[PDB]
Write a protein that binds this DNA or RNA. Structure first.
Ligand SMILES: [K+]
Ligand SMILES: [Mg+2]
Ligand SMILES: [Zn+2]
Lengths: 140, 205, 133, 36
RNA sequence: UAUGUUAAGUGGAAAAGGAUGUGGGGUUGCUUAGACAACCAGGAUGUUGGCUUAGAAGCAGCCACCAUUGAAAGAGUGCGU
């Protein structure tokens, strides 16, 4: 009950970032030391490099913190098989890259525990949805 | 004016009436110009002048040039391409004295350079400035000349803003030119060109 | 709007009794502004109303001005006694009798037409009704 | 208060009411307060 | 006398225009397999959609505006940061 029970939901890359964009005023206002979380989160850098990982900060009844890892984002996993870094400016109207359903099969299994839908097929369409928004062409 | 509103206005939908006729404009306009660094001034476009202007019209003019007499900078635009420009310029100054424009920092911009082949587009010689209002390079250059005359009191300073008071980072992103943005564990450290007015507000940092 | 020339420089005011003999049904556009009561519409009022319609459409769709100011009217200056013959022509009017569709518009959706015409109607000295084909 | 013959909603939060047989619009935005 | 209307002393000066006044008609959508008003949950997930930007995480701005669990929830109606 003391301090804050509340949890702070953000996303950060593989390389430890002290700065403000994601963590700074998402950790500072919670009242953590930050650099401590630059000697912890690196446990989730060696395995998954380059791409981004949604982290869930959980400040309990005590002051201390315990990081809870999640599966990387959809649109971020949708730009390893597209050999690009930045997404498009005007989607559908003008696409930039092209991906294949074979790579979607992996991502449709890689995000299975997080997405509510219990089926193994519905989590293909919803990814082809994130593609339309991104701005790329798909082949089955 | 239209040039500097295309380039350096948050709302660039709003351009003034321009045409190749005598006395196209008759009413002052005022437009906010926000430089890419975030320095802010107002750019005001007035009635034109013409030789032997009736001593009755002159009494009315005084009301329009109320902003020019109260201006921080005065930009005198001459048509360099025309033969009678030294004639036009002196006739203008003589009128301004009658209107009551006194002791105001002046910049004699010579315009329509493109109409000539000899002269180059952007040049400066003190108050003298040669440029073409049609061209962007000319304006980017005129902008720099203004930034030299208005924002002199703008000097460099270092600040350390804890993460809890982010709002202050936003103020520095919006109301000052950031040179470098450094990030520490305790808070954010940002060094910028700010005004004396900001060096009272952010003094604690 | 002015007649290019006129047979006679001066002309009777005339009268505005009865429903307009013609131009009571929208014939070119989709929507029309029908006069409900009679009045002289000066050329200065027709221009005002035309620009007001046109500006709101943004060079979109068509505008027919179905009335033309055929009839001159004269005036006497201030400080001139009655007599010494008819005064000099001042302007041009269209005597609009009731039921006369004054403007018509096509090539914009109902809402914009209906809005264009109310803006036009506010410049005219006559009670108007918006009517469609 | 704007007191004018023509009292109309200026935004969509404007509401037209009657009090004491006067038409008025009331609104969150106090500039929009009108009475006929 | 009979049946209606008006609340303004309108009647017993005055227009453009403005309007949740009040009476009558006439079309028409939803509705006891439950409407409309309120009150009780829910209002999720991909996901901070992408670009843009110091930051833009439904909600400065531009471009899209798909699917998903089913009772259904906009790639978000207003505030707010
Ligand atoms: K009218
Ligand atoms: Mg001008
Ligand atoms: Zn309002």
């Amino acid at each position: 009950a003391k301090k804050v029970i509340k949890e702070v939901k953000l996303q950060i890359p593989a390389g430890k970032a002290n700065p403000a964009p994601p963590v700074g005023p998402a950790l500072g206002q919670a009242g953590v030391n930050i650099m401590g979380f630059c000697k912890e989160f690196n446990a989730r850098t060696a395995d998954q490099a380059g791409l981004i990982i949604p982290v869930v900060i959980t400040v309990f009844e005590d002051r201390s913190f315990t990081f809870i890892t999640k599966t990387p984002p959809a649109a971020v996993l949708l730009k390893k098989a597209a050999k690009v870094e930045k997404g498009s400016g005007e989607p559908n109207k003008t696409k930039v890259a092209s991906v294949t359903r074979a790579q979607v099969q992996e991502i449709a299994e890689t995000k299975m525990p997080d997405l509510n839908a219990a089926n193994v097929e519905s989590a293909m369409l919803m990814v082809e949805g994130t593609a339309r928004s991104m701005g790329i062409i798909i082949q089955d | 004016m239209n040039g500097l509103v295309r380039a350096y206005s948050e709302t660039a939908d709003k351009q003034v009436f321009e045409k190749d006729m005598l006395f196209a404009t008759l009413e002052t306009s005022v437009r906010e110009i926000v430089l890419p660094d975030n320095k802010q001034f107002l750019l005001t476009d007035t009635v034109g002048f013409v030789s032997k202007l009736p001593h009755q019209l002159v009494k009315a003019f005084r009301s329009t040039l109320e902003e020019a007499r109260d201006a921080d900078l005065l930009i005198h635009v001459v048509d360099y391409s025309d033969p009678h420009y030294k004639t036009m310029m002196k006739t203008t100054e003589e009128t301004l004295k009658v209107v009551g424009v006194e002791d105001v920092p002046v910049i004699y911009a010579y315009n329509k350079a493109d109409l000539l082949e000899d002269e180059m587009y952007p040049k400066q010689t003190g108050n003298t400035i040669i440029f073409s209002a049609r061209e962007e390079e000319s304006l980017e250059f005129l902008t720099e000349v203004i930034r030299k005359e208005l924002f002199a009191s703008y000097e460099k300073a270092t600040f350390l803003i804890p993460f809890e008071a982010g709002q202050v980072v936003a103020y520095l992103n919006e109301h000052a030119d950031i040179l470098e943005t450094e990030y520490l564990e305790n808070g954010t450290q940002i060094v910028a060109e700010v005004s004396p007015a900001d060096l009272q507000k952010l003094a604690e940092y | 709007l002015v007649p290019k020339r006129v047979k006679y420089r001066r002309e009777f005011r005339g009268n505005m009794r009865g429903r307009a003999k013609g131009g009571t049904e929208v014939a070119f556009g989709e929507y029309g502004l029908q006069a409900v009561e009679a009045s002289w519409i000066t050329n200065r009022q027709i221009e005002a109303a035309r620009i007001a319609m046109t500006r709101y459409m943004k060079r979109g769709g068509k505008v027919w001005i179905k009335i033309f100011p055929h009839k001159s009217y004269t005036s006497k200056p201030i400080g001139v006694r009655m007599g010494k013959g008819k005064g000099a022509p001042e302007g041009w009017v269209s005597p609009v009798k009731r039921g006369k569709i004054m403007f018509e518009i096509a090539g914009v959706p109902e809402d914009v037409a209906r809005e264009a015409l109310r803006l036009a109607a506010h410049k005219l000295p006559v009670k108007t009704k918006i009517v469609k084909r | 208060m704007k007191v004018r013959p023509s009292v109309k909603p200026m935004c969509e939060k404007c509401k037209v009411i009657r009090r004491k047989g006067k038409v008025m619009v009331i609104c969150e935005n106090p500039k929009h307060k009108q009475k006929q």
